[PDB]
Protein: N-acetylmannosamine-6-phosphate 2-epimerase
Organism: Staphylococcus aureus
Amino acid sequence: MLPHGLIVSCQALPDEPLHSSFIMSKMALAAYEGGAVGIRANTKEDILAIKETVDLPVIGIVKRDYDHSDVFITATSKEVDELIESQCEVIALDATLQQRPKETLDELVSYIRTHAPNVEIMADIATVEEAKNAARLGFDYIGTTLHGYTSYTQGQLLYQNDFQFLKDVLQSVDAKVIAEGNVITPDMYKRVMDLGVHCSVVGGAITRPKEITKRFVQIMED
Amino acid sequence: MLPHGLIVSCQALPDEPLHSSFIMSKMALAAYEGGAVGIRANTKEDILAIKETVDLPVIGIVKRDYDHSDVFITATSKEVDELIESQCEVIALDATLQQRPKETLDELVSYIRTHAPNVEIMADIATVEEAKNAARLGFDYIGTTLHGYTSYTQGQLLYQNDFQFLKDVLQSVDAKVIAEGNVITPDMYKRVMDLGVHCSVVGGAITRPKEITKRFVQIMED
Ligand SMILES: *[C][C@](*)([N]C(*)(*)(C(*)(*)([O])C(*)(*)([O])C(*)(*)(*)([C]O(*)P([O])(=O)O*)O*)C(*)(*)(*)=O)=O*
Ligand SMILES: *[C][C@](*)([N][C]([C]=O)[C@@](*)([O])C(*)(*)([O])C(*)(*)(O*)[C](*)O(*)P(*)(*)(*)([O])(O*)=O*)=O*
Ligand SMILES: [Cl-]
Ligand SMILES: [Cl-]
Ligand SMILES: [Cl-]
Ligand SMILES: [Cl-]
């Protein structure tokens, strides 16, 4: 299971500066040396390289675009199969009811419980009712990952109104909740932990130097 | 010359997981894409790799320990020759009063002016005394890099007492002053720019994921 603490997302998609399974394994080692107690990573090859380098538990995804779908976080059984091969401890997937290329959300959950009974699953959601649906499906973790990143949650950000969206998710499910997406500062990490999340996932504030540089430069442009 | 803005320090010493000229070149590219105006980098190999990746001005150093000296930032003519071969725009050196392994600070300044007359020089200092000595020797930039990192500045940190050390350096020299070392947050960066520094160098807060991770974890331990 994932401990209570800081999970660091070590991702760099194609054309991002640090894109490389090797570089993400070194970002994961850096995060481990700083006190991370889990890693979130994208693709079997990045997961495998990270697991060569740290024993941390890993939340695995495969981000892969499909024609005729807006679902890109572990969209089909093809991505699930790669993640079962990677032997990541947790498989995370988009848990919205948007149109998928192949299997439905219920079919993917069933598929993982059948082909990988020892792996926990994490639901990446954007709404409270998507969080409630994920808890009913038996997800082990429910993450705020897609809040503001679907066409129906545009302009919304996790920290708005003293984390009101997160408070609503925490009130609506008894499953372990993960604060993920837009946990930008240590102050925000402390706030979401004090509100009662199981753990928090921090990517851009630790492992995306372009995004941290932008927050420095932006303080001078206001 | 160095513009007015954010210089990102893209360093990873041999003990650090991200040690690599390739990885530091990608840190510099990310920094460029986020709005950095320059890069600070360590060793000829890293500087050359960065200068093939971005057109930004580079502040070059060679960190190299010597027996019988506490000076480790560009300590001798050996390091200066490596930086002249690098073609970095600015050469930075320890500009403390500490005994060096070979040439004195005054001899190394004369050496650079003779053998690299088109390069600017930057003084890494620890004290107001050392800033005034650097202005005597004609340094183009004077940075606060070593403040708190010498046996005679123990417990001192740039941000203490609302940047009183930086205010004292700014009052004591006409040269271009660089806030470098323990500029940890965009709020600090804005404060030092508001106090009248020419530019600021930020390293650990952008390009050391272990150090950023530690600030997240520490918030929960306090
Ligand atoms: C919306 C989306 N997010 C993915 C990822 O790129 C994010 O970086 C992580 C971590 O969030 P930040 O805001 O801490 O970077 O969720 C999800 O893995 O595609
Ligand atoms: C005192 C010391 N500093 C080095 C100087 O180049 C760098 O490691 C340091 O990262 C750099 O000066 C920027 O400082 P911050 O504190 O932002 O990392 O060895
Ligand atoms: Cl980045
Ligand atoms: Cl800038
Ligand atoms: Cl080279
Ligand atoms: Cl690091």
